[PDB]
From Swiss-Prot:
Organism this protein belongs to: Homo sapiens (Human)
Annotated domain remarks: The coiled coil domain may be involved in RPA2-binding.
Molecular function GO labels: MDM2/MDM4 family protein binding; p53 binding; ubiquitin protein ligase activity; zinc ion binding
Record PTM text: ATM phosphorylation occurs at early times upon DNA damage, while ATR is the major kinase at later times. Phosphorylation by ATM and ATR is required to stabilize p53/TP53. Part of the phosphorylation depends upon RPA2 presence.
Name the record gives this protein: E3 ubiquitin-protein ligase RFWD3
Keywords tagged on the record: Coiled coil, Cytoplasm, Disease variant, DNA damage, DNA repair, Fanconi anemia, Metal-binding, Nucleus, Phosphoprotein, Repeat, Transferase, Ubl conjugation pathway, WD repeat, Zinc, Zinc-finger
WD repeat copies, ranges: 62-104, 106-144, 150-195
Function: E3 ubiquitin-protein ligase required for the repair of DNA interstrand cross-links (ICL) in response to DNA damage. Plays a key role in RPA-mediated DNA damage signaling and repair. Acts by mediating ubiquitination of the RPA complex (RPA1, RPA2 and RPA3 subunits) and RAD51 at stalled replication forks, leading to remove them from DNA damage sites and promote homologous recombination. Also mediates the ubiquitination of p53/TP53 in the late response to DNA damage, and acts as a positive regulator of p53/TP53 stability, thereby regulating the G1/S DNA damage checkpoint.
Keyword Transmembrane (UniProt): no
One GO cellular component term: PML body
Keyword Flavoprotein: no
Length: 337
């Protein structure tokens, strides 16, 4: 059987404080959030670009406070979306190595993601539980606000589920999690969004990860209980129609993978096996990252590391598949072999 084997470790930030990673397939570029290289650049936060073609790159200054989201869109080549506790959403071009657009959200931004349906929309999750929807065609302000349904507390996770020709769940929209609440914001034909409460009760942390083909999401969270533990639940999206013919959207657990006692939470991953057999892998962050088979719910690999894993990111370059795990100072590269 093939599996991931350790290749190399790269130091990202001697000062630590790395948090999240994103990969641009079109430019073969892994970006990693870090504080600025100290006593070299001005103080702040930005990303180190790592060229995966060469496995070499450079630092791009972006924000004044910690980065809480990073995402590339498929529609705008190399255009990095970032969210920061400095109250901004920014678009930074890997083509230009410069910040090309800033939106001042007016409040700390705890998450962001792109629309995967037919729009260049940005979702920004705020400290008060609202989602602002920005349209790249409008550079001055947001075009929608999706207000907090229950509590007003930070919206810490956003993950887009694209529409599909699937009888199980054809709809597209954004999965959204605050510290105490989870909803699916269905995108309608007219590009407005409608909320659907999900049967999850977060109690201090939550992270949504989506797998497009399979209409599943991975939700890693702590339940709202006094004494509990973090778990990662592989969820299948579902729906029924109301009397007007509009859907009521929900989800149900397939597999529950129990984890650790505490919330400061690995941004996990869910993705297609490099084997291209339609199997899906679930990778969960102890000083280990565990890889699970989504079909069977059984464990495939335990990738050991000297430090806690903060983020996990699969990537492909030159007909080979890789996995990156991020710790506070370093990134570990594994190859599928
Ligand atoms: Mg990711």
């Amino acid at each position: 059987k093939h599996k991931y084997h350790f290749q190399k470790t790269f130091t990202v930030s001697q000062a630590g404080n790395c948090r999240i990673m994103a990969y641009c397939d079109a430019l073969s570029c892994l970006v990693i959030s870090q504080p600025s290289p100290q006593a070299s650049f001005l103080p702040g936060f930005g990303v180190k670009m790592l060229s995966t073609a060469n496995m070499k790159s450079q630092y791009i200054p972006m924000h004044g406070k910690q980065i809480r989201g990073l995402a590339f869109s498929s529609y705008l080549r190399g255009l990095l979306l970032s969210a920061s506790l400095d109250n901004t959403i920014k678009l930074t071009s890997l083509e230009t190595n410069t910040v090309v657009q800033t939106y001042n959200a007016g409040r700390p931004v705890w998450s962001c993601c792109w629309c995967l349906d037919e729009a260049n929309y940005i979702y920004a999750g705020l400290a008060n539980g609202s989602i602002l929807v920005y349209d790249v065609r409008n550079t001055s302000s947001h075009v929608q606000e999706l207000v907090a349904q229950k509590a007003r507390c930070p919206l810490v996770s956003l993950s887009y589920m694209p529409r599909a020709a699937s009888a199980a769940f054809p709809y597209g929209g954004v999965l959204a999690g605050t510290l105490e609440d989870a909803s699916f914001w269905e995108q309608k034909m007219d590009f407005s969004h409608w909320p659907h409460v999900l049967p999850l009760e977060p109690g201090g942390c939550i992270d949504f990860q989506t797998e497009n083909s399979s209409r599943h999401c991975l939700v890693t969270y702590r339940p709202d209980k006094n004494h509990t533990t973090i778990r990662s639940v592989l969820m299948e999206m579902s729906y029924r129609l109301d009397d007007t013919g509009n859907p009521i959207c929900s989800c149900q657990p397939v597999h529950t993978f129990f984890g650790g006692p505490t919330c400061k939470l690995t941004k996990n991953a869910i993705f297609q096996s490099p084997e291209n057999d339609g199997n899906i892998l679930v990778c969960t962050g102890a000083n280990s990252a565990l890889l699970w088979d989504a079909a069977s719910g059984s464990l495939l690999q335990d990738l050991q590391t000297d430090q806690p894993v903060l983020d996990i990111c699969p990537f492909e370059v030159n007909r080979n598949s890789y996995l990156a795990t991020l710790t506070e100072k370093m990134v570990h590269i594994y190859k599928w072999e």
